[PDB]
Amino acid sequence: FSLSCNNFNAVFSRISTRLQELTVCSEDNVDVHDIELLQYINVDCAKLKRLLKETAFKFKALKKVAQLAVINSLEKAFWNWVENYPDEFTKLYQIPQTDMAECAEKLFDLVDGFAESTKRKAAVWPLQIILLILCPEIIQDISKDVVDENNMNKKLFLDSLRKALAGHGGSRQLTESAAIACVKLCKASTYINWEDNSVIFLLVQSMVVDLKNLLFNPSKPFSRGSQPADVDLMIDCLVSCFRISPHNNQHFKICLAQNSPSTFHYVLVNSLHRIITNSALDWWPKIDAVYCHSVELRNMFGETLHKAVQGCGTDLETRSYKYLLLSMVKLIHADPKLLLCNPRKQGPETQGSTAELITGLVQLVPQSHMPEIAQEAMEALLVLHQLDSIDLWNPDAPVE
């Protein structure tokens, strides 16, 4: 990735050679490892246009296996540009860019023609949204009257997503695919400053409510596959949803509630971990707004600690606490003030809140059953000793 910054052409040339060979050759080959190099090379807006134009010319002539590999590799490139160049992505919606729109529009039709079966549609639909996102005005036309063919295909896909997204379609794959594709659209919207308040915000609002119910229903745990739930998908959605509505989150209480399954708590803590560690954009909301839940966070830790210690002395139930408990320990390590807000203060007949927190950490250091957690507790306890963190123990008397 660092190498591609300067000598982009050298890497790009080898890929361009591979594209021609598959195009001319009619014997399908599976040495797409050259094609999969896009996932790591640094890409810029100007460079990205080069990739779209070249692939579009050869896209129709590529083999089935090659087409999927480029779609996957090309899709990951888009995030690299957005992440590496957040400003450039904003400029796309700040001012119209026909060249950027045209190449995406041209590729969109080529990809749509390739995919006919439902399984094919599922693989390519997530990319289709990115292409649709690239062209803002086509989204506006979709909302309004639809052109006979220009925006007929685009409008059909958008409404098909909602049906699968809402579960009306009797196809599990499309519902799963719709969630991933829709989530990426929501993630991209997070980057939008919202000063423009383009249709992207309005379109997301249409789908945001549906997405939460599908992924954040405690009664029904969304089971993407063998795993009980797609933890990564849920964390990404929650982080985006938090940024959209940080003032008063409605599912934070649902997840933060003790009755909710551990996975919701596990998703909650991990999501908060990203917020504290990964806040690139200043205008995004900050963790400080969440301090109001500090009291509830401590209660969750106490209950987890009691059962975690009890379990060590079911197989998966006990192991679940260890993963969740370790996440909580790391979360405190990132920021100790998060759980120290609203101190209970020592009662005349009962201990305070800071004391109970410290005692729990101390009794885990010599456990020796979970050295990784015990090692973390030492570091966590070593962070609560900083002169800044000494005051947070009890602001009334920090030297007693």
Coordinates of N, CA, C and O in Angstrom, one line a residue, residues 146-244:
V146 N -39.7 8.3 -13.6 CA -38.6 7.4 -14.0 C -38.5 7.4 -15.5 O -39.6 7.3 -16.2
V147 N -37.3 7.5 -16.1 CA -37.2 7.4 -17.5 C -37.4 6.0 -18.0 O -37.4 5.0 -17.2
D148 N -37.8 5.9 -19.3 CA -38.2 4.6 -19.8 C -37.1 3.6 -19.6 O -37.4 2.4 -19.2
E149 N -35.9 3.9 -19.9 CA -34.8 2.9 -19.8 C -33.6 3.5 -19.0 O -32.9 2.8 -18.4
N150 N -33.4 4.8 -19.1 CA -32.3 5.4 -18.5 C -32.3 5.2 -17.0 O -31.2 4.8 -16.4
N151 N -33.4 5.4 -16.3 CA -33.5 5.2 -14.8 C -34.5 4.1 -14.5 O -34.9 4.0 -13.3
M152 N -35.0 3.3 -15.5 CA -35.9 2.2 -15.2 C -35.1 1.1 -14.5 O -35.6 0.6 -13.5
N153 N -34.0 0.7 -15.0 CA -33.2 -0.3 -14.4 C -32.8 0.1 -13.0 O -32.8 -0.7 -12.0
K154 N -32.3 1.3 -12.8 CA -31.9 1.8 -11.5 C -33.0 1.8 -10.5 O -32.9 1.4 -9.4
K155 N -34.2 2.3 -10.9 CA -35.3 2.4 -10.1 C -35.8 1.0 -9.6 O -36.2 0.7 -8.5
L156 N -35.8 0.0 -10.6 CA -36.2 -1.3 -10.3 C -35.3 -1.9 -9.2 O -35.8 -2.6 -8.3
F157 N -34.0 -1.7 -9.3 CA -33.1 -2.3 -8.3 C -33.3 -1.7 -6.9 O -33.3 -2.4 -5.9
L158 N -33.5 -0.4 -6.9 CA -33.7 0.2 -5.6 C -34.9 -0.3 -4.8 O -34.9 -0.6 -3.6
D159 N -36.0 -0.4 -5.5 CA -37.2 -0.9 -4.9 C -37.1 -2.4 -4.6 O -37.7 -2.9 -3.6
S160 N -36.4 -3.2 -5.4 CA -36.2 -4.6 -5.1 C -35.4 -4.7 -3.8 O -35.6 -5.7 -3.0
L161 N -34.4 -3.8 -3.5 CA -33.7 -3.8 -2.3 C -34.6 -3.7 -1.1 O -34.4 -4.4 -0.1
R162 N -35.6 -2.8 -1.2 CA -36.4 -2.6 0.0 C -37.3 -3.8 0.3 O -37.5 -4.2 1.4
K163 N -37.8 -4.5 -0.8 CA -38.6 -5.6 -0.6 C -37.8 -6.7 0.1 O -38.3 -7.4 1.1
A164 N -36.6 -7.0 -0.4 CA -35.7 -7.9 0.3 C -35.3 -7.4 1.7 O -35.2 -8.2 2.7
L165 N -35.0 -6.1 1.8 CA -34.6 -5.5 3.0 C -35.7 -5.6 4.1 O -35.5 -5.8 5.3
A166 N -37.0 -5.5 3.6 CA -38.1 -5.6 4.5 C -38.6 -7.0 4.7 O -39.6 -7.3 5.5
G167 N -38.0 -8.0 4.0 CA -38.4 -9.4 4.1 C -39.7 -9.8 3.3 O -40.1 -10.9 3.4
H168 N -40.2 -8.9 2.5 CA -41.4 -9.2 1.7 C -41.0 -10.3 0.7 O -41.8 -11.3 0.5
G169 N -39.9 -10.2 0.0 CA -39.4 -11.2 -0.8 C -39.1 -12.5 -0.1 O -38.5 -12.5 1.0
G170 N -39.5 -13.6 -0.6 CA -39.3 -14.9 0.0 C -38.0 -15.5 -0.3 O -37.9 -16.7 -0.8
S171 N -36.9 -14.7 -0.2 CA -35.6 -15.2 -0.5 C -34.6 -14.7 0.6 O -34.4 -13.5 0.8
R172 N -34.0 -15.7 1.3 CA -33.1 -15.4 2.4 C -31.9 -14.7 1.9 O -31.4 -13.8 2.5
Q173 N -31.3 -15.2 0.8 CA -30.1 -14.6 0.3 C -30.2 -13.2 -0.1 O -29.3 -12.4 0.3
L174 N -31.3 -12.8 -0.7 CA -31.5 -11.4 -1.1 C -31.6 -10.5 0.2 O -31.1 -9.4 0.3
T175 N -32.4 -11.0 1.2 CA -32.5 -10.3 2.5 C -31.1 -10.2 3.1 O -30.8 -9.1 3.6
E176 N -30.3 -11.2 3.1 CA -28.9 -11.1 3.6 C -28.1 -10.1 2.8 O -27.4 -9.3 3.3
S177 N -28.2 -10.3 1.5 CA -27.5 -9.4 0.6 C -27.9 -7.9 0.7 O -27.1 -7.0 0.8
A178 N -29.3 -7.8 0.8 CA -29.8 -6.4 1.0 C -29.3 -5.7 2.2 O -29.0 -4.5 2.2
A179 N -29.1 -6.5 3.3 CA -28.6 -5.9 4.5 C -27.2 -5.4 4.3 O -26.9 -4.2 4.7
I180 N -26.3 -6.2 3.7 CA -24.9 -5.8 3.5 C -24.9 -4.6 2.6 O -24.2 -3.6 2.9
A181 N -25.6 -4.6 1.5 CA -25.6 -3.5 0.6 C -26.1 -2.3 1.2 O -25.6 -1.2 1.1
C182 N -27.3 -2.4 1.9 CA -27.9 -1.2 2.5 C -26.9 -0.6 3.6 O -26.8 0.6 3.7
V183 N -26.3 -1.5 4.4 CA -25.4 -1.0 5.4 C -24.3 -0.1 4.9 O -24.0 0.9 5.4
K184 N -23.7 -0.6 3.8 CA -22.6 0.2 3.2 C -23.1 1.6 2.7 O -22.4 2.6 2.9
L185 N -24.3 1.6 2.2 CA -24.9 2.9 1.9 C -25.0 3.8 3.1 O -24.7 5.0 3.1
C186 N -25.5 3.2 4.3 CA -25.6 4.0 5.5 C -24.2 4.4 6.0 O -24.0 5.5 6.4
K187 N -23.2 3.5 5.8 CA -21.8 3.9 6.2 C -21.3 5.1 5.4 O -20.7 6.0 6.0
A188 N -21.6 5.1 4.1 CA -21.1 6.2 3.3 C -21.9 7.5 3.7 O -21.2 8.5 3.7
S189 N -23.1 7.4 4.0 CA -23.9 8.6 4.4 C -23.3 9.2 5.7 O -23.3 10.4 5.8
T190 N -22.7 8.4 6.6 CA -22.1 8.9 7.8 C -21.0 10.0 7.4 O -20.9 11.0 8.1
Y191 N -20.3 9.7 6.3 CA -19.2 10.6 5.9 C -19.8 12.0 5.5 O -19.1 13.0 5.6
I192 N -21.0 12.0 4.9 CA -21.6 13.2 4.4 C -21.8 14.2 5.5 O -22.4 13.8 6.6
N193 N -21.3 15.4 5.3 CA -21.4 16.4 6.4 C -22.9 16.7 6.8 O -23.2 17.1 7.9
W194 N -23.8 16.4 5.8 CA -25.2 16.7 6.0 C -25.6 18.1 5.7 O -26.8 18.5 5.7
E195 N -24.6 19.0 5.5 CA -24.9 20.4 5.2 C -25.6 20.4 3.8 O -26.6 21.2 3.7
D196 N -25.2 19.6 2.9 CA -25.9 19.5 1.6 C -27.3 18.8 1.8 O -28.3 19.3 1.2
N197 N -27.3 17.9 2.7 CA -28.6 17.2 3.0 C -29.2 16.6 1.7 O -30.4 16.7 1.5
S198 N -28.3 15.9 1.0 CA -28.8 15.4 -0.3 C -29.7 14.2 -0.1 O -30.0 13.8 1.0
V199 N -30.2 13.6 -1.2 CA -31.2 12.5 -1.1 C -30.6 11.3 -0.4 O -31.3 10.5 0.1
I200 N -29.3 11.3 -0.3 CA -28.6 10.2 0.4 C -29.1 10.1 1.9 O -29.5 9.0 2.4
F201 N -29.2 11.2 2.5 CA -29.8 11.3 3.9 C -31.2 10.9 3.9 O -31.7 10.1 4.7
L202 N -32.0 11.4 2.9 CA -33.4 11.1 2.8 C -33.6 9.6 2.5 O -34.5 9.0 3.1
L203 N -32.8 9.1 1.6 CA -33.0 7.7 1.2 C -32.6 6.8 2.4 O -33.3 5.8 2.6
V204 N -31.5 7.1 3.1 CA -31.1 6.3 4.2 C -32.2 6.3 5.3 O -32.5 5.3 5.9
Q205 N -32.9 7.5 5.5 CA -33.9 7.5 6.5 C -35.0 6.6 6.2 O -35.7 6.0 7.1
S206 N -35.3 6.4 4.9 CA -36.3 5.4 4.5 C -36.0 4.0 4.9 O -36.8 3.2 5.4
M207 N -34.7 3.6 4.8 CA -34.3 2.3 5.1 C -33.7 2.1 6.5 O -33.6 0.9 6.9
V208 N -33.3 3.2 7.2 CA -32.7 3.0 8.5 C -33.6 2.4 9.5 O -33.2 1.5 10.2
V209 N -34.9 2.8 9.5 CA -35.8 2.2 10.5 C -36.0 0.7 10.2 O -36.0 -0.1 11.2
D210 N -36.1 0.3 9.0 CA -36.2 -1.1 8.7 C -35.0 -1.9 9.1 O -35.1 -3.0 9.6
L211 N -33.8 -1.4 8.9 CA -32.6 -2.1 9.2 C -32.5 -2.4 10.7 O -32.1 -3.5 11.0
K212 N -32.8 -1.4 11.5 CA -32.7 -1.6 12.9 C -33.5 -2.8 13.4 O -33.1 -3.6 14.2
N213 N -34.8 -2.9 13.0 CA -35.7 -3.9 13.4 C -35.1 -5.3 13.0 O -35.2 -6.3 13.8
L214 N -34.5 -5.4 11.8 CA -34.0 -6.7 11.3 C -32.8 -7.1 12.2 O -32.7 -8.3 12.5
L215 N -31.9 -6.2 12.5 CA -30.7 -6.6 13.1 C -30.7 -6.3 14.6 O -29.8 -6.9 15.3
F216 N -31.6 -5.5 15.1 CA -31.6 -5.2 16.6 C -32.9 -5.5 17.2 O -33.5 -4.7 18.0
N217 N -33.4 -6.7 16.9 CA -34.6 -7.2 17.6 C -34.2 -8.3 18.6 O -33.8 -9.4 18.2
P218 N -34.3 -7.9 19.9 CA -33.9 -8.9 20.9 C -34.6 -10.2 20.8 O -34.1 -11.3 21.1
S219 N -35.9 -10.2 20.5 CA -36.7 -11.4 20.5 C -36.2 -12.4 19.4 O -36.1 -13.6 19.7
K220 N -35.9 -11.8 18.3 CA -35.4 -12.7 17.2 C -33.9 -12.3 16.9 O -33.6 -11.2 16.4
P221 N -32.9 -13.2 17.2 CA -31.5 -12.9 16.9 C -31.2 -13.2 15.4 O -31.4 -14.3 14.9
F222 N -30.8 -12.1 14.7 CA -30.5 -12.2 13.3 C -29.3 -13.2 13.1 O -28.2 -12.9 13.6
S223 N -29.5 -14.3 12.4 CA -28.5 -15.3 12.2 C -28.1 -15.3 10.8 O -28.8 -15.9 9.9
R224 N -27.0 -14.6 10.4 CA -26.6 -14.5 9.1 C -26.2 -15.9 8.5 O -26.5 -16.3 7.4
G225 N -25.4 -16.7 9.3 CA -25.0 -18.0 8.9 C -24.8 -19.0 10.1 O -25.7 -19.0 11.0
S226 N -23.8 -19.7 10.1 CA -23.5 -20.7 11.2 C -23.4 -19.9 12.5 O -24.0 -20.4 13.5
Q227 N -22.7 -18.8 12.5 CA -22.6 -18.0 13.8 C -24.0 -17.5 14.2 O -24.9 -17.3 13.4
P228 N -24.2 -17.4 15.5 CA -25.6 -16.9 16.0 C -25.9 -15.6 15.4 O -27.1 -15.4 15.0
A229 N -25.0 -14.7 15.2 CA -25.2 -13.4 14.5 C -23.9 -12.9 13.9 O -22.8 -13.3 14.3
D230 N -24.1 -12.0 12.9 CA -22.9 -11.4 12.3 C -22.5 -10.2 13.1 O -23.0 -9.1 13.0
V231 N -21.6 -10.5 14.1 CA -21.2 -9.5 15.0 C -20.6 -8.3 14.3 O -20.9 -7.1 14.7
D232 N -19.8 -8.6 13.3 CA -19.2 -7.5 12.6 C -20.2 -6.6 11.9 O -20.1 -5.3 12.0
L233 N -21.2 -7.2 11.3 CA -22.2 -6.4 10.6 C -23.0 -5.5 11.6 O -23.3 -4.4 11.4
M234 N -23.4 -6.1 12.8 CA -24.1 -5.4 13.8 C -23.3 -4.2 14.3 O -23.9 -3.1 14.5
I235 N -22.0 -4.4 14.6 CA -21.2 -3.4 15.1 C -21.1 -2.2 14.1 O -21.2 -1.0 14.5
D236 N -21.0 -2.5 12.9 CA -20.9 -1.5 11.9 C -22.2 -0.7 11.8 O -22.1 0.6 11.7
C237 N -23.3 -1.4 11.8 CA -24.6 -0.7 11.7 C -24.8 0.2 12.9 O -25.2 1.4 12.8
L238 N -24.5 -0.3 14.1 CA -24.7 0.5 15.3 C -23.8 1.7 15.3 O -24.3 2.8 15.7
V239 N -22.6 1.6 14.9 CA -21.7 2.8 14.9 C -22.2 3.8 13.9 O -22.3 5.0 14.3
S240 N -22.7 3.4 12.8 CA -23.3 4.3 11.8 C -24.6 5.0 12.4 O -24.8 6.2 12.4
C241 N -25.4 4.1 13.0 CA -26.7 4.6 13.6 C -26.4 5.6 14.7 O -27.1 6.6 14.8
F242 N -25.4 5.3 15.5 CA -25.0 6.2 16.6 C -24.7 7.6 16.0 O -25.1 8.6 16.5
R243 N -23.8 7.6 15.0 CA -23.4 8.9 14.4 C -24.7 9.6 13.8 O -24.7 10.8 13.9
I244 N -25.6 8.9 13.2 CA -26.8 9.5 12.7 C -27.6 10.2 13.8 O -28.1 11.3 13.6

